[PDB]
Symmetry: D2
Subunit: 380 residues, 4 copies
C-alpha cells in the first residue's frame, strides 16, 4: 500500500524452502541438475543467475514499478551495460553535467567503440529535440544532477524519446525509488548507483537497473551474462538489508535538508545555495511535479578555497570522504576532489567555484547538523 | 622458494595494522581523508581500489610472476576488460575452439563495437601468422582448450605477437598458475576464471588478470575503474582463502587424472580420450615444455547419447553440474549442455559427438574415482 | 550530542589504518607477533579479542553510557555469562515473569550448579526487599516484561541492590539504549538480546552486555574468555550496521505503537490491552520516569483461540514468526507458541489467556498497520 | 568409501531447494510459520537451529561416525557445554596436562559450581582407575596432549568409563577426524576446537561436538539452546568449506612432519624431540593402534631462551603467532607464551624448559620447511 510498507513487503526477500524471514546468501557458483537440462529452481550457473541476486533484482523492480531487475558490480557497471545496448555509429544525448564517471566512461571508453555522445542542457527539453541526429538511439538524463542539482523534466523527456524512437534512461540515484519513479513517467530504463542511498551504509559498491520492457530486459540480461559485471551474493544481501530502511532514512534526511537550507540561506558567509527545494531554483515546479521529496545532496558557495577548508575543519558531525548516501553526513569541495581535472577558469565558468561546498545530509539529529554547520560557518 | 611455499607466503595476505594472519574483509565503499587529497593508505573509493581486492590482486600477480593484478566480477568480465583495450576497427586472432562465453561475448557484443575477430587453428602457429591482418592488435589463446584440450605453443605465440606488435593474452584457467606461467614465456597478459580452480570451492564467481607491463596495467586499471566490473571484498577474501590450497588440490587432481586416463584407455566402452598427458595427443611435447602438470578436465567418447546418460546415472561420486575446478568431481555432456546451440552435424564435424563426456576431476580419493567411473562404464 | 547523532558517531566504527568509514570484518583467529609477547595492536587470539567484536562492544558501551562492552553469541549466552559471576550457594532475585529462556536457563541449568533463584513480583520493590536472603548476591530485572509488559522501578531496584550488596542487572532488550539507560540509574550491568531491536533486521543472533564497573568488567571478560560464548566477526559487523538505524526505527515503531493502541482500545473485539504507554497501566508513571519512549511489543485480548487464529490469517502486513524487533511487524499467540508448556489453567491464572495476541510493531507505514489490524479485527 | 571421498561427500552440504552445490549461508534469526506450530522445514529460531549450522553439524557427525553434531562459538564453549552435563558435587578425571583453557575453565569457573576435578597421568590407565571416586561422573582426555604430546589409550579409557558408569569424552583436536575416531573406540563424546585443523585457515573460532548417544545428544542440545554458545551461520559455512581440504592438508602436514623430525633428531642444537611418531615415545604403540596418522604439532628442546628467540628470528617460513592448524607453519615458545603463568621451576619440573620450541607444521613445501628450520638451527 503506502511506501514504508512496500519497502518492507515488496519483492521476494524470504526463503520459500525454510521460511527464513531474510534472503539466504547463496555463496555458490553452480547448481546440481537432476537430469541433463532440468534445473531444480531455474539456477544452473551463478553468473547467469544467483538466488540472492534474484532477491535484490526483484526488490528494485518492485520499488520502481518495473518488471525486471538487474544487479551489477557497480553503478558504472550498470551504466556501461545500458550503453552497450547500442552499436558503433549510434548516438546518445545526455544532460550537460552528468556524473564524472559517466562522462569518463562515455568519452574515454565507449567513444573508442564508435558510440557518439553529445552533452546538452536538458533543463530546456527543446535542447534535446534540437540535439537529435538521424543516428540518435538513446536519451540518458540524471535528475537532479551533481553538484549543482539541475532538474530535467522526466515526463517530457520520455515523450520526446517515444516520439523519436529513443531508448530513454534515467539515472535515479540522487532521488531513490522512494521519491521519484521514472518508469511511471514513461521512461524505458531506470538505474542507480546502489552504492549510495539504496545500500545506504557506505559498505556496498553496486548498481541496479529496472525496466518494464520485456525486449530491453532480454537484451540487458544477455549483456549481463556475456560481459559479466554481476553483483555478488553477499553484496546483494547487504543491499536488500539496507533498502529495508530507505524510507526512514530518506525522511530523516529530508527533514534535516529543509532545516539546513533555511540556515544556509540566512547565513552571511554563504552565497548561492543549490537544491531543487528552493523555490527560485530552475525547474523547481518540474521537480515537484515528478518527485514527492528531495535528495540529500546540497551545494552552497562560501567565499574561497581557504573558507571551504576552514568550514570542513570546524565541523564536528560532517565527515570528509568521497561518495554520498551514507548514514553519516559527508562534506566535500568539488573543485579540489571530483573536478580538479578541469582547468580552474572552466570550473568557474560552470559554477564550480573554489568555495563551492557539497554536503550529503546523513541521518544524525537535525538540530545537531544545523547547529554544527552554523557554528562552523560562524568561524568564517 | 618452491611452489607450495609460494602459495602460502606469496602476496600480501595479512593485516599490517592488527597483525591478523588473514586479510580483513573491507565491506566498505569510501574512506576518511585527513585533509582534502591526502589518503591515509591510498584508498578513497572502493570501485577504484579496496584493500581486500588489493590482497587478491597481489596474490595473482605474485603467482603468475607479474607486477600487476586485477580482480573482476567474473571471468568474462576480465576477458571483456582485456578486449576493451582495443578500438573500433581493431582485429583479434583467437584459437578456433575458445570458451563459449568468450565466443559469445566477441561475436555478439564486441563485434557491434567494430572489433573484428577471426578464430583459427592455433595448434599450428603459422596459422596465426597467416591470419594476421594489417589491423590485428591482439592475439588471445586458451591452452588447453575446452572440451577437446587442444594445446597451443605459448612461447611461439608470444614471439609472433612481439614481432607483429600484438598484445598477447593467455586464458590460463585450465592450468592455473601452479602448472603454467604465460608471463614467463613472453605473454603480455594472463587471465583466469577464478570461478574454477583458483577459488576451487564452487562458491565464488570471479576473474583475475595479471601483467608485468606497466602501460597495459595502467590501461586495464583505467578500464576497470571506468566500466566497474570489480570483484567485491567478500569474494576477494574467499579467493585468497581458496588459493591457499591450490597446490595440494591440483596435485591430488593430477594423481587421479593419471589413473583415470589409464582406466579410460583400457575400457572397451570408451573410444577416443582427450587430454594433453596422452603421448599421442597433438602438441603433447609442447604442453610438457610449457607446463609441469596437467589440467583436471578430461573428455572421452562413449557410444551415443543413451550411453552418456546411463554413465552419468550409474556413478556415485560424479556430480552432474556446470563449471569445473570444484572439490567435487563434475560430469557433463557438452552436446546436451554447453554446445546444444550448435547444429548436431556441425557438432559431429568438430568432434563434439553425442556420446562425448567431459569430467572435471575433483579431490576425492583416486581409487574411488577410478573404480566408480569404471563400474559405471561396465554397465554399458 | 542528541541521540540520533550519538547513534552515528558514538563508538569506534571506522578503520584507523585505511580510513574505511565502516568497521572491517576481521574473519581471523590469530595475529602475528613481532616479538614474543609484543602484540601490534593488542590482539593475539580472536576468542580473547577480535577487532570487529571490539567495535560492537565499544558501540554498546557508548550507547548505554558504560565503559565496557561484551558481545556474546546470543542473548542467553550473555545472560549465562552474567549468572556465572556467582558461585554455588549464591541466590538471585528475578522478576516473576522473566523471559522463558532466562527462566529455563536458571531453573534447569544453573540450579544444578547450586545457584538458587526466586521469582517475585518486582512491580512493588518492597517485594524485592522481603525476598532478600543472607545468600542473595544478584538482582536481575526485565522492564517491561513479556508478554504483559509489567514495569519495574529501575532506580529503586538499584538503590535496594546498592544497600544490600547485590549486583544489579537489567535486561534492557525491550526498550533498547535509545529509550532507557539502566546504568544511568545506578544499575551495575545492562544486557540485551541484540537479536531483537539492536540488530533490528532478524538476521543476527547475539547478546550484548555493558557495565561501568571495572572489577565486574574484569570478571565478565574472564568468563567470556574461559567459557567462549563470543560473537563472531561477521555478526558483530551486522550488529554495528543495524544499530546505525536504531533511532529512526524505534521512532517509526513508536508512532505506530501509539496509533495501534488507540485503535485496539476502541475496537469491540479487543478487551484488555497491555502496554506501558496506557495511563491506567501499573507503574506507568515509573516507566515514564525511567524511559523517554516505548517498546514496540503490545499484547491484547481477543475472545478465544479461534478468534486469535482468524486474526492472524486475516492480516496482510503481520507476519507469523517467533522473536521481536524486526523491520517486519510480527504476530503471535503466546499460549500456543511460547507458553504452551504451562498448563492451561495456570496460563489463565497468570493472564496468558487463549486469545492473548502479541504483536511486535515493525516499521511499515503507520496507517497501513492500523488499518490492516482493524479490518482483521472487524472479521471477528 | 575412502577418507578423501568421505570428506567431499559425507554430510549434507548442498541446497535441496535450488541445488546449489554449497550450503547457503542463512544469515537469519527467525522463520515464517504457515500455521501456529507448523514449521516448514523444522526451523523456528536460529539459536535453537539454523540450516547452515545444521550443515556443519551433519559434517562433524559423519566424519566422526556419530549420529549427532553440535557447533559452538569456540572450542572452550563446546568443552563448557560438555562439562555442564554434570551437577554440583560431580567429579571429573582429566589427563594431567590438559589444554590451558580447559584447565582454567575447570579450576576457575566450574569449580565454583561444585564440580570437582582431578588431573592425573592417564598415560597409565590404571591411574584413571585409582582416581575414580564414588562421585566421578566423567572422564575427559586429550590425546596427544600439548605441548609434550603425551598419548592416552582411548579404547581402554572407554572400557574403564563404561565399567564405572562414566561419560567418556575425548578432545580430538590435535588428530582431527581424519586420523583418529574416538566414537569408534567406545567413547561417548568427541569434541574439537574447529579453530585449528578443521577450519584450517586461521579464520574461524569454533567448537564441534559429536556423539552417537541419543540421550547425551538430547542433553547437549538442551544445554546449547539454554546457554546459547552457538556457532553463527557465516562461521559454520567457512568451517564446511575448510573441512573440504582437511585430508589433503593433513597428508601434506604429515609428510613434512616426518622429514622435519628426521632433521630435528639429527641436528646437534636440538635435544629431546616430542612427537608420537618417534618409536621411543611413551605409548607410541598405543597411538599407532588408535590413529592412522599424526598431528602436526611437534615440540623440541634447544639450549635456552636466547637460542629459542634466535631460532624464531632466523626462520623465513615459520610464523610467530598463537593457535595451531593453520595453512602457515607456526612457531612458539610455551614458557614465554602459553605457560608463562607457571613459576619457572615448576615449568622445568614438567618439561616445559626455557628452550622448548613448539612448531605447528603447515602446508608449505616439505623441503622448504626442513631446510629453513635447519639453517635457522645452524645459526645456533
Ligand atoms: C568530475 C567530472 O565531471 C565531468 C564533466 N565534464 C566534462 C567536461 C567538463 C568541463 C567542465 C566541467 Br565543470 C565539467 C566537465 C568530467 C569529469 C572528469 O572527471 O573528467
Ligand atoms: C559453447 C559454444 O562454443 C562455441 C564456439 N563455436 C562457435 C561456432 C561453432 C561451431 C561449432 C562448434 Br563445435 C563450436 C562453435 C560457441 C558456443 C555458443 O554457446 O554459442
Ligand atoms: C515461556 C516460559 O515462561 C516461563 C515462566 N514461568 C515459569 C513457571 C510459570 C508458570 C506460569 C507461567 Br504463565 C509462566 C511461568 C517459563 C517458560 C518455559 O518455557 O518453560
Ligand atoms: C597453559 C596452562 O597450562 C596449565 C596446566 N597446569 C595447571 C597447573 C600447572 C602446573 C605446571 C604446568 Br607445566 C602446567 C599446569 C594451566 C595453564 C594456565 O594458563 O594457567
Ligand atoms: C502497497 C504495496 C504494493 C503496491 O505499491 P504501489 O505503489 O501501489 O504500486 C506492492 N507491494 C507491496 C508489498 C505493497 O504493500
Ligand atoms: C619462493 C618464493 C617466491 C619466489 O618464487 P619464484 O617461482 O622463484 O619466482 C616468492 N614469494 C615467496 C613467498 C616465496 O616463498
Ligand atoms: C552527543 C554525543 C555523545 C554524548 O552523549 P550523552 O548522551 O550526552 O552521554 C557521545 N558520543 C557522540 C558521538 C555524541 O555525538
Ligand atoms: C565411504 C563413505 C562413507 C562411509 O565411511 P566409513 O568410514 O566407511 O564409515 C560415508 N559417506 C560417504 C559420502 C562416503 O563416501
Ligand atoms: Na516481501
Ligand atoms: Na514503458
Ligand atoms: Na604473504
Ligand atoms: Na613482458
Ligand atoms: Na564513531
Ligand atoms: Na555504577
Ligand atoms: Na554430501
Ligand atoms: Na557409544
Amino acid at each position: 500500500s503506502n511506501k514504508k510498507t512496500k519497502l518492507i513487503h515488496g519483492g521476494h526477500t524470504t526463503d520459500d524452502y525454510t521460511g527464513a524471514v531474510t534472503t539466504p546468501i547463496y555463496q555458490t557458483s553452480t547448481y546440481l541438475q537432476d537430469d541433463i537440462g532440468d534445473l531444480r529452481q531455474g539456477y544452473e550457473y551463478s553468473r547467469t543467475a544467483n538466488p540472492t541476486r534474484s532477491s535484490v533484482e526483484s526488490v528494485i523492480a518492485t520499488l520502481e514499478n518495473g518488471k525486471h531487475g538487474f544487479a551489477f558490480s557497480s553503478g558504472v557497471a550498470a551504466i556501461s551495460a545500458v550503453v552497450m545496448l547500442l552499436d558503433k555509429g549510434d548516438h546518445i544525448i545526455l544532460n550537460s553535467d552528468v556524473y564524472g564517471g559517466t562522462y569518463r566512461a562515455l568519452t574515454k571508453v565507449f567513444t573508442r567503440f564508435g558510440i557518439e555522445v553529445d552533452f546538452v542542457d536538458t533543463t530546456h527539453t527543446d535542447s534535446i529535440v534540437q540535439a537529435i541526429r538521424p543516428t540518435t538511439k538513446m536519451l540518458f538524463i540524471e535528475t537532479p544532477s551533481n553538484p549543482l542539482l539541475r532538474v530535467t523534466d522526466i515526463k517530457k523527456s520520455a515523450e520526446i524519446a517515444k516520439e523519436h524512437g529513443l531508448i530513454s534512461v534515467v539515472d535515479n540515484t540522487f532521488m531513490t525509488p522512494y521519491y521519484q519513479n521514472p518508469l511511471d513517467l514513461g521512461i524505458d530504463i531506470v538505474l542507480h548507483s546502489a552504492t549510495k542511498y539504496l545500500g545506504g551504509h557506505s559498505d556496498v559498491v553496486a548498481g541496479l537497473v529496472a525496466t518494464s520492457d520485456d525486449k530491453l530486459a532480454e537484451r540487458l540480461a544477455f549483456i549481463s551474462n556475456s560481459t559479466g559485471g554481476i553483483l555478488g551474493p553477499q553484496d546483494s544481501y547487504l543491499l536488500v538489508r539496507g533498502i529495508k530502511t530507505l524510507g526512514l532514512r530518506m525522511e530523516q534526511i529530508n527533514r534535516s535538508v529543509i532545516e539546513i537550507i533555511k540556515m544556509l540561506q540566512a547565513h552571511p558567509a554563504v552565497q548561492q545555495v543549490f537544491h531543487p527545494s528552493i523555490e527560485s531554483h530552475l525547474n523547481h515546479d518540474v521537480h515537484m511535479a515528478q518527485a514527492d521529496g528531495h535528495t540529500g545532496v546540497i551545494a552552497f558557495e562560501v567565499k574561497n578555497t581557504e573558507s571551504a577548508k576552514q568550514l570542513i575543519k570546524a565541523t564536528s558531525y560532517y565527515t570528509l570522504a568521497e561518495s554520498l548516501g551514507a548514514v553519516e553526513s559527508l562534506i566535500s569541495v568539488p573543485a579540489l576532489m571530483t573536478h580538479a581535472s578541469i582547468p580552474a577558469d572552466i570550473r568557474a565558468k560552470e559554477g564550480i567555484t573554489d568555495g563551492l561546498v557539497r554536503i550529503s545530509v546523513g541521518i544524525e539529529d537535525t538540530e545537531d547538523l544545523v547547529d554544527d554547520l552554523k557554528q562552523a560557518l560562524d568561524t568564517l
